[PDB]
Amino acid sequence: GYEVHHQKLVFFAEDVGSNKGAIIGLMVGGVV
Amino acid sequence: GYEVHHQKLVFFAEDVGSNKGAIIGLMVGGVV
Amino acid sequence: GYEVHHQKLVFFAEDVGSNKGAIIGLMVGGVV
Amino acid sequence: GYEVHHQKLVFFAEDVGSNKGAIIGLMVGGVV
Amino acid sequence: GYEVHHQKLVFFAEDVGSNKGAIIGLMVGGVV
Amino acid sequence: GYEVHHQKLVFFAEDVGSNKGAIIGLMVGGVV
Amino acid sequence: GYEVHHQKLVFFAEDVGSNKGAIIGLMVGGVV
Amino acid sequence: GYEVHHQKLVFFAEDVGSNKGAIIGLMVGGVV
Amino acid sequence: GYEVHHQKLVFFAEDVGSNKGAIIGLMVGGVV
Amino acid sequence: GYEVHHQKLVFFAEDVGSNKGAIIGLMVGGVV
Amino acid sequence: GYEVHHQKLVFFAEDVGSNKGAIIGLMVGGVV
Amino acid sequence: GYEVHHQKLVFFAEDVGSNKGAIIGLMVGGVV
Amino acid sequence: GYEVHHQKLVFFAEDVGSNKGAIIGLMVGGVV
Amino acid sequence: GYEVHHQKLVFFAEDVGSNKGAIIGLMVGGVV
Amino acid sequence: GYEVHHQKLVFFAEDVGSNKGAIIGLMVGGVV
Amino acid sequence: GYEVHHQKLVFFAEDVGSNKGAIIGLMVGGVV
Amino acid sequence: GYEVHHQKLVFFAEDVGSNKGAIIGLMVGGVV
Amino acid sequence: GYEVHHQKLVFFAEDVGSNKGAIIGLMVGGVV
To the question of whether residue D9 is assigned a binding role by annotation, the answer is no
Query: CB burial class (10 A; 0-12, 13-18, 19+) of residue F4?
Result: exposed
Secondary structure class of K1 (helix, strand, coil): coil
Q: Compute φ and ψ for O11, nearest 5 degrees.
A: -110, 105
One DSSP character per residue, chain N reads --------EEEEEE-TT--S--EEEEEE-S--
Q: How many domains is chain L built from?
A: 1
Q: Compute φ and ψ for E24, nearest 5 degrees.
A: -110, 110
Chain Q contact present for L31, CB below 8 A: yes
Cβ separation C28–B26 shorter than 8 A: no
- Cα O19 from Cα N19, distance rounded (Å): 9
- Cα K6 from Cα J7, distance rounded (Å): 7
| Contact between N9 and M8 (Cβ < 8 Å) | yes
| Burial track Q1-32 (b if 16+ CB lie within 10 A, e otherwise) | eeeeeeeebebebbbeebbbbbbbbbbbbbbb
Which chain J residues are Cβ-neighbours of P25 within 8 angstroms? 30
- Cα H20 from Cα H22, distance rounded (Å): 7
| Contact between E17 and A15 (Cβ < 8 Å) | no
Residue (of N6, I19, A3, R25) closest to O32 by Cα position = N6
Residues 10-29 of N with CB under 8 A from C: 29
Q: Quick one: closest CA in H to M23, which residue? A: H30
| Burial track H1-32 (b if 16+ CB lie within 10 A, e otherwise) | eeeebebebebebebeeeeeebbeeeebebee
Query: CB burial class (10 A; 0-12, 13-18, 19+) of residue J13?
Result: buried
- Cα H29 from Cα G32, distance rounded (Å): 10
DSSP letter, residue L18: S
Residues across chain R: 32
Residue (of N22, H7, J30, G32) closest to Q23 by Cα position = J30
Find the angle CA(E3)-CA(E4)-CA(E8) to the nearest 5 degrees. 160
The residue of G2, G4, G5, G20 whose CB has the most chain J CBs within 10 angstroms, and thus the best one to mutate to test that interface, is: G5
To the question of whether residue R6 is assigned a binding role by annotation, the answer is yes
Which chain M residues are Cβ-neighbours of D24 within 8 angstroms? 30
- Cα M3 from Cα M11, distance rounded (Å): 25
Shortest Cα distance from H6 to chain D (angstroms)? 26
Which chain B residues are Cβ-neighbours of O5 within 8 angstroms? none
Handedness of CA H18, E31, R25, R15 (dihedral sign): negative
CATH code (residue G3): 4.10.230.10
Which chain D residues are Cβ-neighbours of H23 within 8 angstroms? 29-31
- CA distances to C22, D11, D13, E4, I17 from B23, rounded to whole Å, are 6, 10, 9, 37, 43
| Contact between K25 and J26 (Cβ < 8 Å) | yes
Provide the domain limits for residue J6: 1-32
- Cα J26 from Cα J7, distance rounded (Å): 15
| Contact between I25 and B30 (Cβ < 8 Å) | yes
Q26 half-sphere exposure, CB direction, 13 A CA radius: 24
Residues 6+ apart with CB under 8 A from M20: N20
Radius of gyration of chain A (CA): 16
Q: How many helices (H) and strands (E) does chain R have?
A: 0, 2
- Cα Q25 from Cα Q20, distance rounded (Å): 14
- Cα K19 from Cα M15, distance rounded (Å): 53
